[PDB]
Amino acid sequence: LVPRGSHMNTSELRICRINKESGPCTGGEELFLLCDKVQKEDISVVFSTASWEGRADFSQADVHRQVAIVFKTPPYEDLEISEPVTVNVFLQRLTDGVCSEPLPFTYLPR
Amino acid sequence: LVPRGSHMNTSELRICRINKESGPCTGGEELFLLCDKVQKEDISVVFSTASWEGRADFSQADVHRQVAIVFKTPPYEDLEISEPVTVNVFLQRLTDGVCSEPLPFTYLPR
């Protein structure tokens, strides 16, 4: 349960991989990741950086057989980035607020 | 079980989506798709066109919890294509040789 920021990391939540490594900072894009056993009714996908945090948008429906999650990327804090900004994506249980190890995801401009 | 080529289609195998819509005709690229309940020990991923058929490369291991499959794309018949050639990707049970509905995937040159 060892600490990793304001929240807590676990070996219970794990993100195997995302289909798209990058994407535009506008957000809204529809992506989908693989993971281990997750509780469809208690799970979220969060994008973050030291000072910004964005949640993906998806329904319990979008969670396929507890190991995949189709979601819609949140827009990046600033939509006027001029550079490729790669942040952190990771899972997190609502209940115990526990998170998973992050995966790098990079926003791009238009 | 209605016919669709030399083989047979079913409502038992379904490909929800692939992470990458395209890729180079060289093949070898590592992709992964979503699908419904598949038998890890009886399933394959085939790329085809009316006159060419290629199989993806993956192990029973690469099949995650029966709904996702991480595989390696086969090279396209001709690696000297000058144009974007989009073929068909689909599942198929070894035993009953039954297939699924195809999904378009397009090879590209270098």
Curated annotation (Swiss-Prot), chains A, B:
Coiled coil: none
Record's protein name: Transcription factor RelB
Function: NF-kappa-B is a pleiotropic transcription factor which is present in almost all cell types and is involved in many biological processed such as inflammation, immunity, differentiation, cell growth, tumorigenesis and apoptosis. NF-kappa-B is a homo- or heterodimeric complex formed by the Rel-like domain-containing proteins RELA/p65, RELB, NFKB1/p105, NFKB1/p50, REL and NFKB2/p52. The dimers bind at kappa-B sites in the DNA of their target genes and the individual dimers have distinct preferences for different kappa-B sites that they can bind with distinguishable affinity and specificity.
Cysteine pairs bridged by disulfides in the record: none
Gene name as annotated: Relb
Domain notes: Both N- and C-terminal domains are required for transcriptional activation.
Parent-protein start and end of this portion: 277 to 378 of 558
Localization (cell): Nucleus; Cytoplasm, Cytoskeleton, Microtubule organizing center, Centrosome
Domain of life: Eukaryota
Binding partners and assembly: Component of the NF-kappa-B RelB-p50 complex. Component of the NF-kappa-B RelB-p52 complex. Self-associates; the interaction seems to be transient and may prevent degradation allowing for heterodimer formation p50 or p52. Interacts with NFKB1/p50, NFKB2/p52 and NFKB2/p100. Interacts with NFKBID. Interacts with BMAL1 and the interaction is enhanced in the presence of CLOCK.
Post-translational modification: Phosphorylation at 'Thr-103' and 'Ser-573' is followed by proteasomal degradation.
Expression across tissues: Expressed in intestine, thymus and spleen. Undetectable in liver, bome marrow, kidney and testis.
